[PDB]
Symmetry: C3
Subunit: 209 residues, 3 copies
């Protein structure tokens, strides 16, 4: 396999370097814009430079190990023009990937995650630790599912959606592009574009855009 460059040397890049190692990948290093992180390491893996150095590593696969959906879209659209770069798909050895699971490139499926049957993910998705996607779930591009999220059958998550940790989504709910479900929310109604919903039962807090 190609060596891997991890974009983002924060909390998620920390866990994704761990994921990559468990997947048998060689991680060349991180790219990160943080001044203070230049010349630093996570567990023997160096921060190589800033994101505009990505063109020096076209031989590598990339992954954008940043939780914020909009951050991953912003980075892909600025630094990663269509067809110039390749992206890894990282699936933890302890994740369960069932039948007729379709996952597009750049996606991270973390330890203990379960995708049962007929689940479709777009590009640069995250399914974090111990989250569950039941039958017929569809994710767009740049979706973040946090640890322990409970995504019931036939839920649709649009592009740049974020589902917070240990939230629960009723079967057949649709969540439109750019929405955010707060950690622990219990969602029993469809969510409209860019809405932030929180609580039990989930209620509209604000729009994020």
């Amino acid at each position: 396999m190609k060596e891997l460059i991890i974009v983002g040397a924060g909390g998620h890049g920390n866990e994704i370097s761990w994921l990559a190692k468990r997947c048998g990948r060689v991680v060349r290093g991180f790219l990160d814009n943080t001044v203070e992180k230049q010349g630093t390491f996570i567990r023997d893996i160096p921060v190589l430079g800033t994101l505009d150095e990505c063109s020096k590593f076209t031989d590598c696969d990339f992954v954008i190990a940043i939780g914020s959906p909009r951050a991953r879209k912003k980075i892909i659209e600025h630094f990663f023009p269509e067809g110039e770069f390749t992206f890894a798909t990282l699936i933890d050895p302890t994740a369960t990937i069932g039948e007729n699971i379709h996952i597009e490139e750049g996606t991270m499926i973390c330890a203990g995650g379960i995708l049962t049957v007929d689940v479709k993910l777009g590009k640069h998705c995250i399914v974090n630790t111990n989250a569950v996607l039941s039958h017929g779930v569809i994710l767009g591009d740049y979706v973040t599912v946090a640890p322990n999220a409970s995504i019931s059958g036939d839920v649709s998550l649009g592009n740049i959606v974020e589902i917070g940790a240990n939230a629960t989504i009723r079967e057949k709910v649709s969540v439109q592009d750019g929405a955010m479900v707060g950690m622990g929310s219990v969602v029993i109604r469809n969510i409209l574009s860019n809405q932030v919903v929180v609580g039990n039962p989930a209620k509209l807090l604000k729009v994020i855009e």
Copy 2:
């Protein structure tokens, strides 16, 4: 082992055909009453006919792969007279079954489920994806536990109880026959027969019968 007939070719029958395959079972097909599903398939497994065709497959094990507790009881009582048919017990290879676990026939224990010690399940139970039943939990017949439910020590769930996804039940709580706990509920008090409770903390919504 006997070949398997799955009653119900919906979302749960989809996941239970997956479970059966992972358990090394040969699935003969589904029975389903849906007109539009006659002559259809899930992943090479045909819908063979309607439920009244069950008498043509007495050579097979059956499982009732329908989430609603009352649906499974209704189907067993109409179509499956005592002692005429055999039922499979399906335990995902990634489920954890500990010590002194007693599971009666027709039960489905799904991927990532954990039953620790001294857990007793009656007939035709479901313990769905990544749910946990702690020490001394007792389930009656036709109990449905949804994905990620958190059933603490010494909880008692009566017959035809349903616990919604990622709900949490305090230790030593009793839930009487036919009750329903909504998804995400946090249950800290005993629940009476046929009560529907929802929320954090769970409150009585209505009676289901």
Copy 3:
């Protein structure tokens, strides 16, 4: 390895004797102060006597298999003077222990638990069934994390903290010594010493001391 003495022959001692067996340990027996439990067994393992008999088993490792943080501290401080006894560290074979995980003695990591990277636990901690501790989480001494708890990145749990089942803690939250988070709580703010918080969103209920 040394044989093991389990202090506490209740629900948690039941599950920890199971854990010990799965870890390939020989359990000599339980110590328990309950009159009615003298001469009793859990799955072939006897209650040997009361806690003041611990000095007859200095050849053994001990574990304090009692959920209440304050109970474990009380027992260690009364019966287990510094340097007289050794404590087991029990990690279920199905727990995931990642990289740069530091766990001090007496700790129990239960089935399906996940500790990702840079997690630090003090002495006599519990991480129960299917709980998740994300990057940079720090636990003090005598912390109890209940089943399915969702402890996000960089959370700090002080000494004698208890996090209830399937609760969710926002990243970078600090919980000071002796606090309690109720089952199912959704914690988005720092918690002060000995505070009990419950609900979604978590609110102060009372002080425990």
